[PDB]
Design a protein around this nucleic acid. Structure first.
Ligand SMILES: [Cl-]
Ligand SMILES: [Cl-]
Ligand SMILES: [Cl-]
Ligand SMILES: [Cl-]
Ligand SMILES: [Mg+2]
Ligand SMILES: [Mg+2]
Ligand SMILES: [Mg+2]
Ligand SMILES: [Mg+2]
Ligand SMILES: [Mg+2]
Ligand SMILES: [Mg+2]
Ligand SMILES: [Mg+2]
Ligand SMILES: [Mg+2]
Ligand SMILES: [Mg+2]
Ligand SMILES: [Mg+2]
Ligand SMILES: [Mg+2]
Ligand SMILES: [Mg+2]
Ligand SMILES: [Mg+2]
Ligand SMILES: [Mg+2]
Ligand SMILES: [Mg+2]
Ligand SMILES: [Mg+2]
Ligand SMILES: [Mg+2]
Ligand SMILES: [Mg+2]
Ligand SMILES: [Mg+2]
Ligand SMILES: [Mg+2]
Ligand SMILES: [Mg+2]
Ligand SMILES: [Mg+2]
Lengths: 55, 185, 148, 220, 49, 159, 51
RNA sequence: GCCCUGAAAAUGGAUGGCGCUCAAGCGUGUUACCUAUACUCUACCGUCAGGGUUGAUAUGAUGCCCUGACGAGUAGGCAGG
RNA sequence: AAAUAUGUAAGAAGUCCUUGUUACUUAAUUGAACGUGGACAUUUGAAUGAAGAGCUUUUAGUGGGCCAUUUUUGGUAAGC
RNA sequence: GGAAUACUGCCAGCUGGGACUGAGGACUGCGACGUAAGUCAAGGAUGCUGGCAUAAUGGUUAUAUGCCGCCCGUCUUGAAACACGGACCAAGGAGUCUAACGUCUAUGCGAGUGUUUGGGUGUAAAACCCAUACGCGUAAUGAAAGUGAACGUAGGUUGGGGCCUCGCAAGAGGUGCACAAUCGACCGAUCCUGAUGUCUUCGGAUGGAUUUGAGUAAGAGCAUAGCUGUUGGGACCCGAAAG
RNA sequence: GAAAUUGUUGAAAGGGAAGGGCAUUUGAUCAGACA
């Protein structure tokens, strides 16, 4: 007994019931995948400027 | 026929009354319902909504959290308002002389506040003193520290706790959790 | 109670909420944890990673009593002194009158240092102590006495 | 407080009606002068051997004539954005490039044209409702208009009509304040055996230009 | 029989467990019996403790 | 069976333009990319390293990382009923600066100049773009431009 | 409680639009237009009647 | 273009039927007219939303009242009875 | 080399002026990244609309489909 | 050369006939006409009159007439089906209880919480009272030996309700809990660095690392109860060929 | 001393089923105010 193989019928209508969410944007995006050499120095740069404003 | 752009007969989704049957709680709701209607003060509306919250949405606020809030610049002589329970905290050794208004005080929390010269009052006494919420600080406890939260959103590469009864060497530390056994998450 | 269940509301609705097509059969999919690696793998790989396999080394005839060692942090060290005596010790911080705390008698095995204690000397007796816990105790003028 | 405050309120109402009286008189001469200038401009061009080309229309009135079943998604979205969610609903639309392309997508579902002053006045007087706090409120008094559109300088029903026919700086606010008009079927019928063809081909949908006035008045 | 995010259960009920169910309905009755036994033993035995 | 390889169905997408084969001109390597720049992706068929997947052909993204011979680009991809964030490591041959804002930055500069210029003279500086408006009235003269009458033509074959 | 249509209920027509009294009194709905005498040029007439 | 020849199937038979020939047929144009649970206005029921009102001496503040919009439904969910 | 579909942008998380941090980078206070302080308010950067937006937990049924217009494959064709 | 009329459009021009509706229930509003007092068609019907006071209106029921109406239940893409069950009536007849749990909600107390294994007591399977333990929670992380959570107002930046100050308002500044994003610090594992000292092989200070954890960073849990969901049980009810 | 089912009596309808929906005629029967 052969049956249906594949179809995309009704799939777009299901997607538009609640979906198609535009991605939310955050200030300060995560630094995942950034060059490690840049991240090591930027950590030290942030530490130094903390003391300048604190003092 | 109408081509509706939104769902019909949709409820607001916000509590408009307490779920409980406490007679005294309904009296406080009746008092602040009147105040919120005829004072145009944002403090009264916030308190009225907070009285409808369930138990998980009203975490306890310890006296140490109260003491830290009073260390804010210019907040030393404000009345701390907690719509919920105030618990005791022995990790702190010095307590100021503030005034705290809360629904409930534990025996330890009440003793510590009174010992330092402060007073513990109810929310209806607060309304007489500050009908418009003058010189008030609203403190809320932590919601995400609840033990049930750490299991929400479980999945690969999510870093969430699994729902498990026994924790140990032989309980969910094999294949799927280390590269030596198939793969790691 | 039975009168509040949805069974009462399903009276007169044929399928009792189980559907007409799928129906409510005996055991579709097997019993218990059946098919954990074949047709329930997805639900096992997520929500339960690490279930299949073995990791550590065995331990024949393990007795839990050998590993009894409750931990107490420094931020709760003064709770072992009864409240009616805490106040006089805090205001009279001096040598030759340091209170003695027996953590073992209170049911603790090791003292860990997390919080901050007042600058008051105290004599702490314990079976075990962490390096940081001893330093904070001695910084306040106290001492740790090892016991068994 | 039995006669002092009431007298002050009556005095203020007298002043408000005087302002409305002068504005309506000024609007009347503005309409009359503009109509005569256009007519005289055509005669002058013909006398000089030239042709006077009238400026393109700046306002249209759009009426939905199709039901809510079996509508493709893109035209369906455009009808919702024009606040035409049921048959025989109507709204005013300002004519720009960004709105002309919208009308092209919904041609087989609506009938629109260029309204006249008489049509606009009758629509607002009989079926004019205001959207106040998300509620449909009839425009039975000038105070409710002033309380909602006074910050834009609109304080009477004639001022609202003036902002519509002459597309003013605050056309968007004045037009959105008006609730979409609920019209009935035409009293003498549609005049065609089959509505769902283009007006050129003997149907009803599309742009019928000045002929929209006869259709709307029968539906009003 | 595995679905949703739930803990793994280990309920041991694959034998004829219903044949070996012990409900302590006589908890109050046995307390009365023990108190009676202590009372009658104290009187019977001696003025001993 | 079916075939779903990495470069499936890219027979024409990754070809070079006509009479534009060979080496890459040097201006491609002299351009400078910084984090936050907007770039568009177009693969080059002669550079097989750092090549994007065919889905990202013609897509536009934002640079988030800079390396020796490549940059990192962020792309929003719609999967199911929501968009997911995608990060790509592409060599500079496959990207170029997007002009979708170079003509917008000049409008920002123009707005500031016009706002300051009218500050001393006139209120309502009117720095909003407007769509095309309907034409105003005009007069058309027939001096030397008498209208010419046209009629439909009869049918002919001319085959 | 009951919407009353102006242009058929005169009292409502006077509540709104106080100028309605002046419009009716001066017969502004039947205002005669000033007579002009401009004539089209010969080029306009010849074009109109041209085949 | 219309009409005719080309054009043969089995119970009796179907432009739906009767019947119709400057049609009650075919192509085209102009009006009047008929009627859906659709559209417009009004009343009533319910649902949802936004608001008013604790003042005692008369009873329900889960009360009373004002305003606007909405109402198809298998499998299934929830609520009030 | 179309038509229809399709990516991005149209500002306050913006622009500009001045100058602080670093173990990165530069022949080099050169640059990169992140900041201190100053200047510009909502005709604050197109249109229309917006029963407000955002977010979380939990669970039912379903996982045999079929038809119409248009595009389209196998087949003489099929209510295939 | 001078008009008329047709066609189209406007009037806050006038006026006749017909039908349906009368919601609301002291006053309050906006207007109109008047020198005024007042009046009015102005935020929803009143005035006058006749017949009958009972089966007259109306309800119920049977019948007649016009139009309409195929047999329910079930599986199914599709049932009035030439698909299946059903001749009729009464009574019986199918998601239950239990052990262990997820989410949510109510209640008590709260860094704790749980009297009821047991003891005391009793108007005697109830109610009332209670010690010592034990369970869970308050510390995690490693296979393990083991080690074990403050550089700092328990950190910085951005967004934040409420509160505070100024202000008629609009706004500006101050403080900012919960929560969201991000950069750091702390604890365990892993990979490195290897000081003062030495049972010369022990000891592991100090400083690091695109590594890693169901962690810390002024606690939230424990107990009882309810709907819904999960698993083992006869397991919603009835049914095999077998062993 | 219920129903299925049956006898007698009374009323009504019936040209290849019967039963039903909306509306009204006819027959029978009935409550409510007489303020
Ligand atoms: Cl399908
Ligand atoms: Cl229900
Ligand atoms: Cl249709
Ligand atoms: Cl370890
Ligand atoms: Mg299938
Ligand atoms: Mg149902
Ligand atoms: Mg079934
Ligand atoms: Mg297999
Ligand atoms: Mg008619
Ligand atoms: Mg028709
Ligand atoms: Mg290679
Ligand atoms: Mg004909
Ligand atoms: Mg209808
Ligand atoms: Mg419904
Ligand atoms: Mg199936
Ligand atoms: Mg009758
Ligand atoms: Mg029929
Ligand atoms: Mg079949
Ligand atoms: Mg059937
Ligand atoms: Mg069968
Ligand atoms: Mg049968
Ligand atoms: Mg029965
Ligand atoms: Mg059997
Ligand atoms: Mg066998
Ligand atoms: Mg008998
Ligand atoms: Mg019988």
């Amino acid at each position: 007994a052969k049956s249906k193989n594949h179809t995309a019928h009704n799939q777009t209508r299901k997607a538009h019931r609640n979906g198609i969410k535009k991605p939310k944007t955050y200030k300060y995006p995560s630094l995942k995948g950034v060059d490690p050499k840049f991240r090591r120095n930027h950590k030290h740069a942030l530490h130094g400027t903390a003391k300048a404003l604190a003092a | 026929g109408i081509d509706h752009t939104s769902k019909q007969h949709k409820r607001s989704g916000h509590r408009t009354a307490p779920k409980s049957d406490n007679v005294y709680l309904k009296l406080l709701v009746k008092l602040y319902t009147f105040l919120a209607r005829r004072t145009d003060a944002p403090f009264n509306k916030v308190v009225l909504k907070a009285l409808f919250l369930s138990k998980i949405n009203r975490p306890p606020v310890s006296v140490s959290r109260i003491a830290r809030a009073l260390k804010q610049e210019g907040a030393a002589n404000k009345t701390v308002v907690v719509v919920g329970t105030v618990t005791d905290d022995a990790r702190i050794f010095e307590f100021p002389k503030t005034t705290v208004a809360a629904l409930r005080f534990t025996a330890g929390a009440r003793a510590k506040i009174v010992k330092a010269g402060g007073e513990c009052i109810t929310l209806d006494q607060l309304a007489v003193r500050a009908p418009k919420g003058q010189n008030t600080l609203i403190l809320r406890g932590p919601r995400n520290s609840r033990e049930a939260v750490r299991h929400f959103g479980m999945g690969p590469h999510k870093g969430k706790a699994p729902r498990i009864l026994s924790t140990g060497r032989k309980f969910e530390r094999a294949r799927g959790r280390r590269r030596s056994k198939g793969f790691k998450v | 109670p039975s009168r509040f269940t949805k069974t009462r509301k399903h009276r007169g609705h044929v399928s009792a909420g189980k559907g007409r097509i799928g129906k409510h059969r005996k055991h579709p999919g097997g019993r218990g944890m059946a098919g954990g690696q074949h047709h329930h793998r997805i639900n096992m790989d997520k929500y339960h990673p690490g279930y299949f396999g073995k990791v550590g080394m065995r331990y024949f005839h393990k007795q839990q009593a050998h590993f009894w060692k409750p931990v107490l942090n420094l931020d709760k060290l003064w709770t072992l002194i009864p409240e009616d005596k805490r106040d006089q010790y805090l205001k009279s911080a001096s040598k030759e009158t340091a209170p003695v705390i027996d953590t073992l008698a209170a049911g603790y095995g090791k003292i860990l240092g997390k919080g901050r204690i007042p600058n008051v000397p105290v004599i702490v007796k314990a079976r075990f102590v962490s390096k940081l816990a001893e330093e904070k105790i001695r910084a306040a003028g106290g001492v740790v006495e090892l016991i068994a | 407080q039995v006669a002092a405050e009431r007298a002050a309120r009556k005095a203020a109402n007298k002043e408000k009606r005087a302002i409305i009286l002068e504005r309506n008189a000024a609007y009347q001469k503005e309409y009359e002068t503009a109509e005569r200038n256009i007519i005289q401009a055509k005669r002058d061009a013909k006398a000089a051997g030239s042709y006077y080309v009238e400026a393109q229309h700046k306002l249209v009135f759009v009426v939905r004539i199709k039901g809510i079943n079996k509508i493709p998604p893109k035209p369906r979205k455009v009808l919702q954005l024009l606040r035409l969610t049921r048959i025989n609903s109507g709204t005013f639309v300002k004519v720009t490039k960004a709105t002309l392309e919208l009308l092209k997508l919904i041609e087989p579902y609506v009938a629109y044209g260029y309204p006249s002053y008489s049509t606009i006045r009758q629509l607002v007087y009989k079926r004019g409702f205001g959207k106040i706090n998300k509620q449909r409120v009839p425009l039975s008094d000038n105070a409710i208009i002033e309380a909602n559109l006074g910050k834009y300088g609109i304080l009477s029903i004639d001022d609202l009509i003036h902002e519509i026919i002459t597309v003013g700086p605050h056309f968007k606010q004045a037009n959105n304040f008006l609730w979409p008009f609920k019209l009935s079927n035409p009293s003498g019928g549609w005049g065609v055996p089959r509505k769902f063809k283009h007006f050129i081909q003997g149907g009803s949908f599309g742009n019928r230009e000045e002929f929209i006035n006869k259709l709307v008045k029968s539906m009003n | 029989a595995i679905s949703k995010n739930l803990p793994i259960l280990k309920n041991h009920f694959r034998k004829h467990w219903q044949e070996r169910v012990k409900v302590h309905f006589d908890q109050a009755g046995k307390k009365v019996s023990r108190r009676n036994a202590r009372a009658t033993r104290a009187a019977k035995i001696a003025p001993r403790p | 069976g079916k075939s779903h390889g990495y470069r499936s169905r890219t027979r024409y997408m990754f070809q070079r333009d006509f009479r534009k084969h060979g080496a890459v001109h040097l201006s491609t390597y002299l351009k400078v990319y910084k984090v936050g720049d907007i770039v568009d992706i177009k693969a080059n068929g002669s550079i097989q390293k750092g090549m994007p997947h065919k889905f990202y052909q013609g897509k536009t993204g934002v640079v988030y990382n800079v390396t020796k011979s490549s940059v990192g680009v962020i792309i929003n991809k719609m999967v199911g009923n929501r968009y997911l964030e995608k990060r790509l490591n592409l060599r500079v041959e496959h990207i170029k600066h997007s002009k979708c804002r170079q003509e917008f930055l000049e409008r920002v500069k123009a707005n500031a100049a016009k706002r300051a210029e009218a500050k001393a003279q006139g209120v309502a500086v009117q720095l909003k773009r407007q769509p095309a408006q309907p034409r105003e009235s005009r007069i058309v003269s027939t001096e030397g431009n008498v209208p010419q009458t046209l009629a439909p033509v009869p049918y002919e074959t001319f085959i | 409680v009951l919407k009353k249509n102006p242009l058929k209920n005169k009292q409502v027509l006077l509540r709104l639009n106080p100028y309605a009294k002046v419009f009716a009194a001066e017969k502004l709905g039947s205002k005669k237009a000033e007579k002009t005498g401009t004539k089209p040029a010969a080029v306009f007439t010849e074009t109109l009647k041209h085949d």
